[PDB]
A paper describes a structure:
Bdellovibrio bacteriovorus are small predatory bacteria which invade the periplasm of other Gram-negative bacteria, round up these (typically formerly rod-shaped) prey bacteria into spherical, osmotically stable structures called bdelloplasts, kill the prey and replicate within them. Essential to bdelloplast “sculpting” is modification, by the Bdellovibrio, of the prey cell wall peptidoglycan in the prey bacterium's periplasm. In this study we have discovered a novel use of some evolutionarily diversified class C PBPs, by the predatory bacterium Bdellovibrio bacteriovorus HD100 when they invade prey and construct the osmotically stable bdelloplast from the prey cell. Compared to the active enzyme, Bd3459 (S70A) bound significantly less Bocillin-FL as would be predicted. Together these data establish that Bd3459 is a PBP with DD-carboxy- and DD-endopeptidase activity, as suggested by the bioinformatic analysis of the protein sequence.
The largest structural difference in Bd3459 in comparison to the PBP4-grouping of enzymes is the absence from Bd3459 of a classical domain III, an all-beta structure that sits adjacent to the TP active site in conventional PBP4s and is responsible for PBP4 dimerization. Domain III has also been postulated to regulate substrate access and limit the ability of PBP4 proteins to bind bulky substrates. The domain II:III:TP contacts of housekeeping PBP4 enzymes are replaced in Bd3459 by a region of novel structure, composed of AA 144–210. When building and refining the Bd3459 structure, it was apparent that a covalent modification of S70 had occurred during purification/crystallization. The tetrahedral arrangement of the reacted sulphonyl group is reminiscent of a transpeptidase acylenzyme transition state, with atom O1 occupying the classical “oxyanion hole” formed by the backbone amide groups of S70 and S360. When comparing the Bd3459 and PBP4 structures, this sequence insertion takes effect between N292 and N303 and forms a “thumb-like” hairpin on the periphery of the active site pocket.
Author numbering: 37 to 438
Amino acid sequence: MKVYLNSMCHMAANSKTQQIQGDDNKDDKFPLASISKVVTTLWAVDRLGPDYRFKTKLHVTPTANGSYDIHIEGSRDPLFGRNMSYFLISELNRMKITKIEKLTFDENFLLAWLAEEKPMIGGTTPKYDTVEQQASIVRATLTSSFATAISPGYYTILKTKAARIGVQMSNRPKIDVRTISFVKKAEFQKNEKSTTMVLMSAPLKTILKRMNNQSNNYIADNLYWNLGGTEAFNAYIAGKMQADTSDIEFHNGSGNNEGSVAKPVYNEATCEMMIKVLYSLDKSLSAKGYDLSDVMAVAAKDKASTVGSYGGVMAGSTTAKTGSVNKAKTLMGSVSTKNGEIYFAVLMHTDYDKSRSDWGVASQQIKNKVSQLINQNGGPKAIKYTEQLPLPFDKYSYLTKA
């Protein structure tokens, strides 16, 4: 690979002028890769708030034969796949539901079994043209995965993690489901003897922490669509930053290639816009009592993240999001130094076709530049942070009768 710097820039968090320091390319657009996910994080924090929960509702009606019909009124929870399903099945059994006759769901019930795994973390997030096409696929996933025997290995890994955050799950959960179909919200009205039960996701801050630890494309793309997509994003950023297409041009929430191999399309912005995003996201989280480390990964301390391997002066001092696509490798976040907290962004150009004997070049240049920033500012100052365990649910997610 051959590499060169597109731009690097930075700003003290307490600057009274909010002038951004950096090279002469700091106001030129460059591909962002997954540092796009911090922009989606800021939009989601501003629109929904860090303590927002996706409230998926189950409408449960007893049946004549002693079982239940259940209709899922979806919430567009963007992290509802295998692990939330396992928790839901545990919770159904805790609520004495073991057999379902008719399971139906609406167009806001988004289910992607592998949402937190390969290949959805790094894949092209499915984009459906109609709700019927989406639901065809959700029905198939409910039939093949939700309704069939639970994997003992994945389930016991989840249950042990859930216990660490104070959530109870049963040892041998099991559900039987007779029939599964799509019912649009406009075609659903509850039965007279139905009980509504609410399954809340973990708070948005936790969903964002998991996304920004893993670099999860599925979660990022579905948050961006849920908030209105590109037309809504462009208006949000024009109203928030007085920015326009010359500052920032997005097409999806993840930063992944949104086009074809021969016509690729990547989110782009200027380095200065990345600093203004971080300043605004830090300000919105502080108003709710949170820090960037509540939604972004901490070097070394978040071992289940793309910066768990980072060491040196960044370990424990630096909160940051990585990105990589064919032509760009990027990093942005904050460094905590003896002279205070400093926002930064580093945007590198990569060419993988050349000098194939050379690898890890852009990553190591970025680490060296960020380390230098910390050291010019008196060295690292450890932040206050305990490694989080961000699962799709928490101890307030239990099914609860409304």
